[PDB]
């Protein structure tokens, strides 16, 4: 329904929706912006991610509440309603993955854009994997493949403190721990990522230092949780 | 329970 | 779309949606329950109110953010987007008012149900008044009339500590202060309501005492803000 | 800024 609105107007309204905490609107505006067919800038990629991460985040939180009630339950209502939320979550993930495949990833040539999108692809397959049962293995391998491609590019093209590289490794480590039942791989990735970033902090300005150390703290928090 | 990356980078 | 679901199932799913913090779903379930045509119980009235108050509350918060940006702005985008949120808010209020008029209020014979619904009618006209400009005066009088009818019943049929009577007077006082530009009426109503409740607390059990004093604290907080 | 009634009573 966004086809008649100017790209610049969609971006402006996505920024307004973020300020208004209207994340479903924000996601619809950014979907419309992507469908204009132009590549996204750094700021626009962040808007897209913020919008859909907040939308899917509400769905994931709801699904976890309903799943817990359903598990303590074992009427059809809690299963039916969990299934409805689960279907809506899968629809949001499929929309995001569709935007990445048509055609954000294939047009992303720079490391910063390609790694961002491949991490996103891994993330939204990971959210699908969180609720998957029947075809879980193929969804898990799709997440792994996207994360792995992103990792290979980030190790060749970005410094170890680059915030996208750090956030990618953070999420791939969560994938290993929570999805792939590979806790030792999760811990090893988080530790190696943290240590290599630490040794690169000396190259950074004060503001880049703050950006990188914020994500490093998340790696440290998880390592503490896991060990 | 583990933390994942912020939406923005 | 809820016509095919059992009333009991709609109520159960409204309770699940509340636990999942899915208030749009909760409102849709409770709208479906109301449209079954049976009167609502005390618990069901509370579900209806919780659902729509959280839905409209998100819209009001968004509208206030956008209005503030728009006022500091004086492109068409912020006005256009404020208007979109405003239209969606008006649609939610019209839905609630439609449920009250068809046919919750006319079938409400007991004081507890009739006062609850008439307060709700005042509340959702008040939310309409918050954004109204052209026809504001008729919307304001519709809120006043609903609140006044509710007040007259509550003073005849309920003790001064009854939580619905207290919440009604609280909201009518906010109406006077914020909507009707009658701050002295707001302060007088809040003070008289507080004092009459105070003198009736001795009749209450420990749990009713907690219910009434919670709303009395809101009256006291507002009086402090206003004086 | 003033507080209004909780949704539930
Ligand atoms: Ca070990
Ligand atoms: Ca005076
Ligand atoms: Cl939203
Ligand atoms: Cl359902
Ligand atoms: Cl892939
Ligand atoms: Cl520990
Ligand atoms: Cl919602
Ligand atoms: Cl708009
Ligand atoms: Cl009326
Ligand atoms: Cl004061
Ligand atoms: Mg154009
Ligand atoms: Mg049942
Ligand atoms: Mg950062
Ligand atoms: Mg039936
Ligand atoms: Mg403009
Ligand atoms: Mg109470």
Residue numbers in the entry:
A (entry chain A), C (entry chain A): -3 to 70, 78 to 137, 139 to 231
B (entry chain P), D (entry chain P): 124 to 132
Sentences reproduced from the published study:
The 14-3-3σ protein, which has multiple interacting partners with specific peptidic motifs, was used as a case study. We have observed this phenomenon first-hand with human 14-3-3σ, a protein which has several hundred known interacting partners in the cell. Furthermore, different isoforms of the 14-3-3 protein are function-specific. For example, the 14-3-3σ isoform (but not other isoforms) specifically targets p53 and is associated with tumour suppression, making it invaluable to determine crystal structures of the target peptide with the correct isoform.
To address this problem, we present a combined co-crystallization and peptide-soaking approach to obtain crystals for any 14-3-3σ–peptide complex that may exhibit difficulties when crystallizing under our optimized ‘sigma’ conditions. The second step involves, after these 14-3-3σ–cJun-pS227 crystals are fully grown, displacement of the c-Jun peptide via addition of the desired peptide for the final structure at high concentration to the crystal drop and incubation for a period of time until full occupancy of the peptide is achieved. We have found useful criteria to be using the peptide at >95% purity and performing the soaking at 277 K with an incubation time of one week. To demonstrate the experimental reliability of the method, we considered this approach for peptides found in the PDB where co-crystal structures were published with isoforms of 14-3-3 other than the sigma isoform, since they were not able to crystallize under the standard ‘sigma’ conditions or any of the other hundreds of screening conditions tested. Not only does this significantly reduce the production time, but new 14-3-3–peptide structures that were previously not accessible with the 14-3-3σ isoform, despite screening hundreds of other different conditions, were now also able to be resolved. The new strategy that we present here has allowed the determination of several new structures of 14-3-3σ which had not previously been possible, illustrating the ease and success of the method. All models were determined to belong to the orthorhombic space group C2221 using Zanuda. In addition, the method retains the robust, stable, high-resolution and well diffracting features of crystals originally grown in the sigma screen.
